[PDB]
């Protein structure tokens, strides 16, 4: 069997919260080294990649590698029945027929379990390439989320301009324009060689920031001509990365 | 006249909150010994019974027994204009023509009063029978409400299974299934002779738990073949009971 | 140029919150002595008057008087991107072509700016007359807002009756009636010579109380036959006044 006990169960609730708007169904790939999901959003625009490593769980067993096709709407609904304090265990027989979620409240007197039916999915097989980035900005996840919420009241698209000493996000539309200038030092840190300037759909960034509760930092990785990576580290465990192509 | 002063006015606000979704109009029966309501829900599915005893009020007068036909939507709207801290008095001349609600804030400088027109209702005359229960579970009202909210994401119907040492609530539907196991000891206490297992519409239980703020305990009384009683004691005053038939 | 720095930026956010439901576009008249707006609501029912005096700003410059036609929906949206803690500056070149709002967070590491296009408006030219009031009631803005919210559940119209020692607000409708009696002393103070009794659309009062966060006091000025003035002082700076004709 597969069995992953997570004492900080809320990590899972939050991971589902951060994917349900983007993806209806995907493979969770289970292996010795942990849990891996890679999928395109349901409109084929961004690509989402999730890593939850073994070590990050309180107990972790995997006897055979599995590819469980999970309906994320369903998993999300079920994770909403877990309390924020609960210990959450994922468990599946190796035939990968159903997935169990078990929620045990800390006062060990209530225990919930849900079994969700798994699907077989034919999934578009994709490989994320080797990529160098001219530019990596690391900033509080809260700020980034507010910038994206704010500019979306102004237009559809944000232009991100990155220099050695600061980053600027701008948009414009019917009502006029806006920008927000952030300076290098919560901490803001820029590592760049080339300066970049790219443009992105605020709609997708707004979905990405559903991940905000997973981490108090977000990292933006950019380079001329290649997708932006918006990464949230799930402390001591892995990351959730979103990939989005610049507009032209 | 009829006059009931309630210093903890919020009890009334909460009682209306716990009935408005279930019942549009009903008789409040006023007598010496207190206030009594018995009515079927507006779809003829569950039966609601309310007791507010004399002693429970700070002052209580009743000179003639009354049967006031009250529109509960109306009474609810008006009770929403009372502050949570207010002293609330119900008052009616014995002709039962209108009902007054008076709300006096504790800083005795603001006083509100509303008069609502009363109706004459022809009401379906019902008698609740003598019943023994194989099984009575007493548990925190909050938990019960969360169980009902949670399982309703899974299916329509909850199967309640009761043993000497614990109770289990299960449901299933399109997305898979769920159950929650609660153990006997907030305190959970089971008094049973026969074990029972019955099934109920989560829709009605969900309405019943609108009563949750009235008490931190709820009591479930069950027996093969007869309606479940979901009871909330209104401390030092009476109870609100809901009755619901098991499905088959 | 025109430039007004406001360290307590939230005053502006709140002023827009208190006008956006009432008015789509209006002239902000800029002069040496401060900022002035006067406009009818978009249905031609009430008149709104705003004063923000020079002295009230931390820095204030005006080199030429301006009449900026501002879309208030737009200004409102943009002011929603300011944090409550931010320092807000209004700035316009004297040609009055666009208006800039600059939001600098207190940790001087983030700075936002928005430019909104200005319009030329042909506006209905009105003069508010000299008026004496029989009656002026000063009361907590919170209470007034609750009275208006509450009575609107009862009817459309509130009858305000004012005596030397107290004020009463009443309404009635389908469900029955209500009144709230407030006594002269939070503080309630009546200055009257003639007693008045007038009736007003609760719809407009409800819009007016969108101003509640600007001040913890509201002042009602009344007189037979003339509009009511609902005034909110914006401490150390000016006022927002709404004018509304009694019904007959
Ligand atoms: N045809 C595919 C989607 O339906 C296109 C696609 C493939 C890949 I691999 C993508 O992911 C990445 C990730 C990092 C990169 O540098 C480039 C593409 C994306 I966004 C879209
Ligand atoms: N930190 C300094 C004030 O103490 C001045 C300052 C402020 C900001 I915001 C900065 O950041 C940016 C970022 C992007 C821009 O386009 C302009 C300034 C810099 I560099 C210096
Ligand atoms: N025909 C009636 C409803 O329209 C049926 C009815 C009558 C009674 I009295 C009920 O109440 C109880 C209460 C306790 C019991 O043991 C049995 C019925 C119910 I639920 C439905
Ligand atoms: N309390 C013990 C752990 O310290 C073990 C335990 C846990 C639960 I939840 C229990 O309750 C139930 C209730 C219903 C069931 O169907 C199964 C266990 C029992 I009995 C013992
Ligand atoms: N025809 C105008 C509106 O479209 C009517 C109008 C004019 C004025 I000046 C008003 O304002 C006041 C303000 C104070 C007063 O004593 C009288 C009118 C109002 I309310 C409506
Ligand atoms: N303050 C006194 C109780 O300590 C009694 C009291 C209460 C109220 I409310 C009052 O106010 C009103 C206001 C309007 C009315 O129509 C009647 C009473 C007065 I004058 C005295």
User: For residue A154, which of A137, A131, A133, A178 has the smallest C-alpha distance?
Assistant: A178
Using alpha carbons, list the distances in angstroms from residue A60 to A4, A30, A33, A50, A53.
5, 11, 9, 17, 10
Helices (H) and strands (E) in chain B, counts: 4, 18
Sign of CA dihedral B94, B100, B103, B108: negative
What letter does residue C56 receive in the DSSP assignment?
Answer: G
Q: Which residue owns the Cα nearest ligand 4 atom 18?
A: B181
Nearby residues of B175 by Cβ (< 8 Å), 6 or more positions away: A71, A74, A77, A78, A116, A117, B153, B154
Task: Assess contact for A244 and A40: CB atoms under 8 A.
Answer: no
Tokens of C157: 């119209």
Nearby residues of B245 by Cβ (< 8 Å), 6 or more positions away: B45, B226, B227, B228
Task: Assess contact for C139 and B110: CB atoms under 8 A.
Answer: no
* Resolution in angstrom units: 2.8
- Helix (H) or strand (E) holding C193, with range, is none
B117 contact residues in C (CB cutoff 8 A): 175-176
| CA gap A33, C103 in Å, rounded | 47
- Residues comprising chain C, all counted: 248
DSSP secondary structure string for all residues of B69-95 = EEEHHHHHHHHTTS-TT-EEEEEE-TT
Give the side-chain half-sphere CA count within 13 A for C190. Answer: 20
Residue of C175, C176, C182 lying closest to B110 (CB–CB): C182
Shortest Cα distance, chain A CAs vs residue C83, angstroms: 10
Q: B29 by DSSP, 3-state: which?
A: strand
* Contacts by B227-231, CB closer than 8 A, 24 or more apart: B227/B47, B228/B160, B228/B198, B228/B200, B229/B133, B230/B205
DSSP secondary structure string for all residues of B99-161 = EEEEEE-SSTTEEEEEEEE-B--------PPP---SEEEEEEHHHHHHHHHHHHTT-SEEEEE
Residue of B143, B177, B185 lying closest to A115 (CB–CB): B177
| CA gap B163, B165 in Å, rounded | 6
Work out the angle between the directed axes of helices B72-79 and B10-20 (0-180°, nearest 10): 140
CATH number at residue B147: 3.70.10.10
Using alpha carbons, list the distances in angstroms from residue A210 to A33, A157, A221, B195.
26, 18, 18, 46
Shortest Cα distance, chain C CAs vs residue B84, angstroms: 13
Structural domain total, chain A? 1
- Residues comprising chain A, all counted: 248
Buried b (16+ CB within 10 A) or exposed e, C87-97: bbbbbbeeebe
Give the side-chain half-sphere CA count within 13 A for A9. Answer: 19
Count residue pairs from A and C with Cβ separation < 8 A: 47
User: For residue A10, which of A96, A92, A106 has the smallest C-alpha distance?
Assistant: A106
Tokens of A196: 């970049």
Give the side-chain half-sphere CA count within 13 A for C6. Answer: 30
CA angle C125, C129, C135 (to 5 degrees): 140
Task: Assess contact for C228 and C244: CB atoms under 8 A.
Answer: yes
Tokens of C40: 């009818």
End-to-end CA distance of chain C: give it in Å, rounded. 47
Q: What's the domain range around C67?
A: 1-248
User: For residue C214, which of C231, C189, C227, C202 has the smallest C-alpha distance?
Assistant: C231
Nearby residues of C12 by Cβ (< 8 Å), 6 or more positions away: C6, C79, C82, C88, C90
**CB A45 less than 6 A from any atom of ligand 1:** no
Interface of A with C (CB under 8 A): 143, 146, 150, 153-154, 175-183, 185, 188
């Amino acid at each position: 069997m597969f069995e992953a006990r997570l004492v900080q169960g809320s990590i899972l609730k939050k991971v589902l919260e951060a994917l349900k708007d983007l993806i209806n169904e995907a493979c969770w790939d289970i292996s010795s080294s942990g849990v891996n999901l890679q999928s395109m959003d349901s409109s084929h625009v961004s690509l989402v990649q999730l890593t939850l490593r073994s070590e990050g769980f309180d107990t972790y067993r995997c006897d055979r590698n599995l590819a469980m096709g999970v309906n994320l709407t369903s998993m999300s609904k079920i994770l909403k029945c877990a309390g924020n304090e609960d210990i959450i265990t994922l468990r599946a027989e190796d035939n990968a027929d159903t997935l169990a979620l078990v929620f045990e409240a800390p006062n060990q007197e209530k225990v919930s379990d849900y079994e969700m039916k798994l699907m077989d999915l034919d999934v578009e097989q994709l490989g994320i390439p080797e990529q160098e980035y001219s530019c990596v900005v690391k900033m509080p996840s809260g700020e980034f989320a507010r910038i994206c919420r704010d500019l979306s009241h102004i237009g559809d698209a944000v232009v991100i301009s990155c220099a050695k000493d600061g980053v600027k996000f701008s948009a414009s539309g019917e009502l006029g324009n806006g920008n927000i200038k952030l300076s290098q030092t919560e901490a803001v840190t820029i590592e760049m060689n080339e300066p970049v300037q790219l443009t992105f759909a605020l709609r997708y960034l707004n979905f990405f920031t559903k991940a905000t509760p997973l981490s108090s930092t977000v990292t933006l990785s950019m380079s001329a001509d290649v997708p932006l990576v918006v990464e949230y580290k799930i402390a001591d465990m892995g990351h959730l990365k979103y990939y989005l192509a610049p507009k032209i």
